[PDB]
Amino acid sequence: RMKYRKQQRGRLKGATKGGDYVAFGDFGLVALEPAWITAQQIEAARVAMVRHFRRGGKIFIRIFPDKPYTKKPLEVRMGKGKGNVEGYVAVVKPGRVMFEVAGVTEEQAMEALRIAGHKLPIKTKIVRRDAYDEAQ
Amino acid sequence: KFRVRNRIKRTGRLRLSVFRSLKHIYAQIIDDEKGVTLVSASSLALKLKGNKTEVARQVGRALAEKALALGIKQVAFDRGPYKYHGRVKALAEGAREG
Amino acid sequence: LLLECTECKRRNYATEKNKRNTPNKLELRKYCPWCRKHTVHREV
Amino acid sequence: TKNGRDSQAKRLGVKRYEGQVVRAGNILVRQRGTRFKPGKNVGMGRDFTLFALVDGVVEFQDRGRLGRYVHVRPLA
Amino acid sequence: VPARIICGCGNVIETYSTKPEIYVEVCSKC
Amino acid sequence: PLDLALKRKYYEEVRPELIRRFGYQNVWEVPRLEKVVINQGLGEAKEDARILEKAAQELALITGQKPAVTRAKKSISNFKLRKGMPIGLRVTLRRDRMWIFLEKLLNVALPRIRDFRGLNPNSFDGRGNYNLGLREQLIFPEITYDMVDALRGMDIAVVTTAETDEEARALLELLGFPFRK
RNA sequence: UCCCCCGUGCCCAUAGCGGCGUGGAACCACCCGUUCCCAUUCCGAACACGGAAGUGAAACGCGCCAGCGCCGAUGGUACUGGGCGGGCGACCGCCUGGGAGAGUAGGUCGGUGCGGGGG
RNA sequence: AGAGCGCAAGGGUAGAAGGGGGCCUGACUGCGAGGCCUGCAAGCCGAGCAGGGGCGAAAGCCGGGCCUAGUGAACCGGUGGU
RNA sequence: CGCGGGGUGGAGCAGCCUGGUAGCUCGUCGGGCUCAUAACCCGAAGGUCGUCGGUUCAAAUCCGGCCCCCGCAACCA
Ligand SMILES: [Mg+2]
Ligand SMILES: [Mg+2]
Ligand SMILES: [Mg+2]
Ligand SMILES: [Mg+2]
Ligand SMILES: [Mg+2]
Ligand SMILES: [Mg+2]
Ligand SMILES: [Mg+2]
Ligand SMILES: [Mg+2]
Ligand SMILES: [Mg+2]
Ligand SMILES: [Mg+2]
Ligand SMILES: [Mg+2]
Ligand SMILES: [Mg+2]
Ligand SMILES: [Mg+2]
Numbered sequence: 001r002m003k004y005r006k007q008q009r010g011r012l013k014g015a016t017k018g019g020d021y022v023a024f025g026d027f028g029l030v031a032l033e034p035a036w037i038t039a040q041q042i043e044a045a046r047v048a049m050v051r052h053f054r055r056g057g058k059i060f061i062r063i064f065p066d067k068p069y070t071k072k073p074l075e076v077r078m079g080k081g082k083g084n085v086e087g088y089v090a091v092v093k094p095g096r097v098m099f100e101v102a103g104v105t106e107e108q109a110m111e112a113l114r115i116a117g118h119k120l121p122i123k124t125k126i127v128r129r130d131a132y133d134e135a136q
Numbered sequence: 137k138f139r140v141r142n143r144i145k146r147t148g149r150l151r152l153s154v155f156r157s158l159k160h161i162y163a164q165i166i167d168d169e170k171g172v173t174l175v176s177a178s179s180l181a182l183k184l185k186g187n188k189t190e191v192a193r194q195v196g197r198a199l200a201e202k203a204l205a206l207g208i209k210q211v212a213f214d215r216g217p218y219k220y221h222g223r224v225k226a227l228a229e230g231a232r233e234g
Numbered sequence: 235l236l237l238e239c240t241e242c243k244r245r246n247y248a249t250e251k252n253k254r255n256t257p258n259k260l261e262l263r264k265y266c267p268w269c270r271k272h273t274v275h276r277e278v
Numbered sequence: 279t280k281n282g283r284d285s286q287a288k289r290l291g292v293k294r295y296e297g298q299v300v301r302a303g304n305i306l307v308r309q310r311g312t313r314f315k316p317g318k319n320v321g322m323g324r325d326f327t328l329f330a331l332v333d334g335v336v337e338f339q340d341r342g343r344l345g346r347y348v349h350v351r352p353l354a
Numbered sequence: 355v356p357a358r359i360i361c362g363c364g365n366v367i368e369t370y371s372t373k374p375e376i377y378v379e380v381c382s383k384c
Numbered sequence: 385p386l387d388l389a390l391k392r393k394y395y396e397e398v399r400p401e402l403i404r405r406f407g408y409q410n411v412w413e414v415p416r417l418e419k420v421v422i423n424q425g426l427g428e429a430k431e432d433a434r435i436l437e438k439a440a441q442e443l444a445l446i447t448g449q450k451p452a453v454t455r456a457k458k459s460i461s462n463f464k465l466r467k468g469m470p471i472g473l474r475v476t477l478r479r480d481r482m483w484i485f486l487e488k489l490l491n492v493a494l495p496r497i498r499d500f501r502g503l504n505p506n507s508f509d510g511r512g513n514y515n516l517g518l519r520e521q522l523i524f525p526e527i528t529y530d531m532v533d534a535l536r537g538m539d540i541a542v543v544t545t546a547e548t549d550e551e552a553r554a555l556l557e558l559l560g561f562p563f564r565k
Numbered sequence: 566u567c568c569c570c571c572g573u574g575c576c577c578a579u580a581g582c583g584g585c586g587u588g589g590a591a592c593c594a595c596c597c598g599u600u601c602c603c604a605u606u607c608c609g610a611a612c613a614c615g616g617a618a619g620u621g622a623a624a625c626g627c628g629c630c631a632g633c634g635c636c637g638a639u640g641g642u643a644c645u646g647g648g649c650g651g652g653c654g655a656c657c658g659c660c661u662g663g664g665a666g667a668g669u670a671g672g673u674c675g676g677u678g679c680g681g682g683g684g
Numbered sequence: 685a686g687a688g689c690g691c692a693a694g695g696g697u698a699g700a701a702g703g704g705g706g707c708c709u710g711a712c713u714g715c716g717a718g719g720c721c722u723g724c725a726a727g728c729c730g731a732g733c734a735g736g737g738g739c740g741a742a743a744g745c746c747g748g749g750c751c752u753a754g755u756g757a758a759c760c761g762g763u764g765g766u
Numbered sequence: 767c768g769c770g771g772g773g774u775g776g777a778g779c780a781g782c783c784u785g786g787u788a789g790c791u792c793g794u795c796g797g798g799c800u801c802a803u804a805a806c807c808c809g810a811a812g813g814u815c816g817u818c819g820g821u822u823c824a825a826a827u828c829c830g831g832c833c834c835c836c837g838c839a840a841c842c843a
Contacts, residue, residue, distance in 0.1 A: 002819095005831090011655095012655070012656085013644095013656090014643075014644085014656095014657095016643060016644090017643095033655075033656090034655065034656080035655075073767080075767095078279070079279035079281075080279065134668080134669095136669095137699090138699070139699070139700080141699090142699060143743090143744085143745095144743065144744095145574095146316075147743060147744075148743080151573090153572065153573060155571080155572050155573080157571085157592085157593070157594090158593080158594070158595090159616080160571090160592085160593090162571075162572060162681075163572095164572065164573070164679095164680065164681080165680095166572085166573060166574075166679085166680080168574070169318075169574095170574085170575095170678090170679090171573075171574035171575065171678060171679060171680095172574090172678085172679050172680075173572085173573075173679055173680035173681080174680080175680095176572090176680050176681055177681095178571090178572095178681060178682075180592095181571075181591095181592075181681075181682045181683095182681085182682080186616090187615095188614090188615085188616090189602095189614085189615090210743085211742075211743065212743060213741090213742065213743065214573095216572095216573095218612095219603090219612060219613075220741065220742085221602075221603065221612085221613065221614095222602070222603080222612095222613055222614065223613090223614090225602095225741085228741080228742080229741085232741090232742085240764090244765095245764065245765045245766090246764095246765080247764070247765085248712090249711085250711075251711080263709055263711085264708095264709060264712095264737080264738090265709090265712070265713090266710095266712050266713050266735095266736070266737080267713080268713065268714090271713090271735070271736050271737085272712090272736060272737060285752090285753075287721095288721090288752070289720085289721060290695095290720095290752090293719090293720060300718095300719095301717085301718055301719080302717065302718055302719095302731075302732095303717060303718035303719055303729090303730060303731060303732095304718065304719055304720085305718090305719050305720045305728095305729060305730085306719095306720095307720095308720060308721090308728090308729085309695080309696090309751095310694075310695035310696070310751075310752070311694090311695045311696025311697080311750075311751065311752095312695085312696045312697070312701095312750090313695070313696075321730080321731070322729090323728090323729050323730060324728095324729080324750090324751070325728075325729065325751060325752070326695095326696080326750085326751065326752095327719095327720080327728085327729050327730080329718085329719070329720090329729070329730065329731080330718085330719090330731090331730095331731060331732095332731095340577095341576090341577065342576090342577040342578090343577050343578095343699085344577075344699080357488075357525065357526075359491065359492060359525060361492075367389070367487070367491060369388065369389070369484055369487040369488060369491070370385055370388065370448070370480075370484040370487070371445075371448055371484065371488060371525060371526055372445055372448070372526050373526060376492075376525045376526065378492055378496070378525055379496065380495050380496050381491055381492060381495050381496075382490065382491045382495055386598095408622090409622080410619095410620060410621075410622045411619070411620065411622090412595075412596085412619090412620055412621080412622045412623075413620095413622045413623090414622095418610085419608090419610075421608095444607095447607090449607065449608070450607050450608075451607065452606070452607035452608085453606070453607090454606090454607095458823080459822095459823030459824080460823080461786090461822095461823045461824045462823095462824090465823085466823045466824090467823070474607075475607055475608080476607060476608050476610080477607080477608060478608060478609095478610070479608080479609085479610095481608085482608095545622090545623085606704090606705085
């Protein structure tokens with residue numbers, strides 16, 4: 001990344017913008033609850049996704065962490081926290097689309113996304129595709 | 137270009153838009169905050185002969201008569217992106233000389 | 235550098251601020267005293 | 279750390295509003311730069327302060343490209 | 355003044371420049 | 385001094401020829417010469433103020449006009465230059481003094497150029513104009529050899545109402561420009 | 566009363582980028598010249614002066630077209646004065662009043678004052 | 685307008701506040717309607733008036749730098765005048 | 767981890783404050799003395815200035831962040 005040091009905490013209101021639509025691939029993974037997803041949680045799901053089906057197709061990770069996660073070294077109250085301990089996170093709100101595979105069968109995706117679900121803190125759901133876009 | 141124009145706008149009343157042609161030289165006493173011309177003594181497009189400079193002097197005197205008739209006197213001149221020296225000079229020159 | 239201007243043939247001062255090394259040695263700017271009106275003011 | 283710092287509040291913005299009577303000289307609105315332009319019977323100072331020159335009522339007039347002007351319509 | 359280029363090969367042109375007696379050579383004539 | 389060779393060369397030769405190769409409708413549409421300009425990158429004369437006057441006066445003769453000055457604005461830290469001090473030479477000429485210069489050009493300068501081959505037909509700005517470079521300034525007539533303290537280079541340009549370089553190539557060749565074909 | 570122009574103010578892009586076409590007697594610009602007023606750190610390019618020819622190309626004025634810029638409802642949401650309920654929490658839902666942004670249909674190569682020249 | 689506006693950042697700005705040349709010293713004295721801000725003190729804006737002076741043909745602008753930081757009550761004492 | 771100091775040719779130090787323009791010593795290289803070597807004499811080569819971004823016309827030099835070295839401090843319970 002790149003920008004500067006620290007950022008506010010902020011609350012996680014309605015599941016508004018934190019939500020989209022299967023923009024790529026065939027299948028997808030949607031969050032049911034709000035939460036800051038850690039960089040490790042992402043890597044955890046990603047590796048587990050590709051490691052399941054070897055030489056798999058293409059995996060799209062729509063979300064992206066950029067919020068500095070603050071934290072203090074087990075002391076008290078001098079200034080703002082050093083943060084960075086857990087690294088970064090992404091404002092994931094219900095409805096959002098974290099992962100979505102492509103160029104692969106339905107069983108591989110059904111299992112891989114299911115697996116990559118446990119790698120994530122939030123209770124999730126898997127959506128097919130339908131045709132819901134925006135046209136005529 | 138029209139900096140000068142805007143300077144006079146906020147100044148007061150009775151502007152004197154001196155738009156001159158390469159051969160003609162018009163002149164109007166427009167009052168802002170309403171947009172209405174009063175004494176509009178044209179030059180070549182009016183009656184005068186053919187001598188831009190001397191024609192300017194007279195057309196300026198033309199404003200004076202028509203103006204002094206309506207009870208005006210505020211000399212709110214309007215350079216109108218023009219250097220004061222030649223044609224436009226005689227304009228306010230003759231108009232103010234009487 | 236703190237500067238103070240004096241009046242010619244009289245005794246009056248004024249607030250000022252000259253420059254040390256910067257191009258500025260003397261100060262021959264005009265000014266307005268109380269007695270009479272307008273007379274040249276030197277640095278001094 | 280080294281951060282706890284902030285110049286106190288200057289308390290700027292719109293002081294007078296449209297539909298308000300005013301004396302002569304009232305600082306109609308203080309501003310940072312030219313968030314508002316002068317106008318009919320309205321002068322300004324170094325800090326771009328808007329203030330009445332006459333007695334009357336405040337009025338606002340947006341004009342897109344030109345900007346937002348403010349003036350006082352005289353009456354008595 | 356009419357600068358007469360006296361290029362030594364058979365050409366004397368009356369242009370315009372300082373000093374008419376312009377001694378040149380190998381001009382456009384050759 | 386409104387009278388010379390190149391003068392009438394444009395009128396009674398190039399003017400009609402341009403009506404042939406393309407053909408126009410208005411006399412004000414036919415490509416007209418109207419602006420010649422000179423220039424001298426004098427990052428050299430930065431140190432010496434004397435060397436600057438020399439280049440300008442040598443320039444005054446060849447241009448048959450009055451020289452001018454134009455300093456930089458940025459700051460070439462790499463070459464001892466910065467804000468507003470150094471120098472750059474330039475002199476714009478038109479009307480009569482324009483034609484007289486173009487005469488010395490293709491009749492005195494170009495000829496005795498070091499192994500002259502022509503003028504690169506690619507030097508067009510893409511539009512109806514042209515720009516060329518020149519080293520030795522002594523190639524000009526009035527310039528004496530036992531006087532030039534330095535072979536100060538310089539490049540010149542020339543503007544025209546032309547909008548296509550084809551009209552430019554045609555116009556210029558008719559004007560007597562020896563293009564390196 | 567009505568039409569085309571010159572000036573000049575109002576609405577502040579539905580009035581502009583652009584491609585094409587039209588206009589010259591009249592208005593306007595360009596164009597001729599540099600003696601005089603005046604001027605370009607160099608140039609009559611512009612600023613200025615005395616004015617015939619030519620043009621309407623440049624620029625400007627008037628029309629046409631929606632490729633870009635621009636304006637853009639309707640319906641439904643998001644959010645929220647006020648009232649109320651559910652969870653352990655992160656939070657979620659209902660009554661009343663209010664209600665965008667985005668996107669879609671669509672709309673635009675401008676309207677309008679006063680003075681002046683010509684029919 | 686994404687530059688520039690001496691120096692931080694912001695609001696502002698080419699319909700100048702930005703770059704250049706000419707003349708020149710309002711980087712005046714004596715005042716100050718009426719205001720913003722405000723516990724106090726302090727800070728900040730300012731039309732208009734008089735004397736007198738600069739630039740401009742003039743309408744007019746000038747009571748220091750586009751602006752908001754560049755500062756210190758009182759006491760005690762220094763120097764020049766009244 | 768709190769305070770201060772410093773990373774510069776192969777080794778050890780200067781240059782930083784007050785910005786342009788890398789200095790000394792040993793070592794290495796070529797040459798000469800000597801039967802030979804060392805010493806000694808002559809000439810020469812070698813630096814991304816820890817690392818990334820920034821300030822300026824321009825950064826070893828000024829400012830800010832990270833890695834490593836050195837010195838101090840860490841008390842009352
Ligand atoms: Mg889960
Ligand atoms: Mg036609
Ligand atoms: Mg909308
Ligand atoms: Mg800016
Ligand atoms: Mg200025
Ligand atoms: Mg200034
Ligand atoms: Mg008070
Ligand atoms: Mg203060
Ligand atoms: Mg007075
Ligand atoms: Mg005491
Ligand atoms: Mg080391
Ligand atoms: Mg040994
Ligand atoms: Mg210790």
